[PDB]
Amino acid sequence: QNFCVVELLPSDPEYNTVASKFNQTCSHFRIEKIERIQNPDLWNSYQAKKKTMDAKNGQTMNEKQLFHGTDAGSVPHVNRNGFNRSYAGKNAVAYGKGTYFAVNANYSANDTYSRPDANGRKHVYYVRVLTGIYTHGNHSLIVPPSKNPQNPTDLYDTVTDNVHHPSLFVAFYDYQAYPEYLITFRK
Numbered sequence: 065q066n067f068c069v070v071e072l073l074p075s076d077p078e079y080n081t082v083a084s085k086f087n088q089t090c091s092h093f094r095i096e097k098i099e100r101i102q103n104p105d106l107w108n109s110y111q112a113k114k115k116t117m118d119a120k121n122g123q124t125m126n127e128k129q130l131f132h133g134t135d136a137g138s139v140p141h142v143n144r145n146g147f148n149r150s151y152a153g154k155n156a157v158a159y160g161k162g163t164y165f166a167v168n169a170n171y172s173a174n175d176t177y178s179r180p181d182a183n184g185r186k187h188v189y190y191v192r193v194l195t196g197i198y199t200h201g202n203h204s205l206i207v208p209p210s211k212n213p214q215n216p217t218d219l220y221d222t223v224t225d226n227v228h229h230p231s232l233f234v235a236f237y238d239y240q241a242y243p244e245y246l247i248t249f250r251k
């Protein structure tokens with residue numbers, strides 16, 4: 065429930081990694097700051113989920129770093145809780161009801177997701193997400209579908225808009241995502 069926020073200096077390698085990724089598609093924005101969110105209990109629950117996923121998915125690289133735009137007022141909620149059940153920015157559209165994450169930052173930089181606040185600042189997290197093994201989503205999902213109807217325990221881990229060339233992923237569970245970095249920027 066408790067956490068720390070550490071601002072990255074522009075000259076730190078970590079700053080540059082995050083900024084470079086963001087700027088692949090968001091170079092016309094101006095980055096005001098980049099912070100690392102340190103929430104030990106959330107990190108520990110996320111690592112336990114990764115350890116379980118890594119034990120079951122074979123060679124799959126279960127983790128992706130993806131983007132999530134949100135309004136200024138959701139930042140304290142995400143910082144304490146991650147993208148949990150009460151997170152007001154969960155969405156229910158063509159790929160299911162859950163939390164939506166973008167492969168590319170420009171998608172999250174849309175004003176609909178990273179709403180500019182009264183000072184014009186926009187907020188996009190760069191999030192460790194356990195994408196695991198995924199399939200094509202659909203509007204009815206609140207959890208991902210089962211992989212094999214002949215042994216329906218094991219579900220897909222996430223769903224996506226396009227299995228072989230994804231642009232977004234939907235995660236349905238708490239502790240499937242860790243809000244590692246917060247990028248504050250403007251137009």
Ligand SMILES: NC(=O)c1cccc(NC(=O)/C=C\C(=O)O)c1
Pocket residue numbers: 131132133134155157158164165166171172173177232233
């Ligand atoms: N909030 C986000 O940054 C984000 C990331 C990826 C996708 C979306 N999209 C949606 O919330 C809804 C529908 C969709 O893309 O088709 C938002």
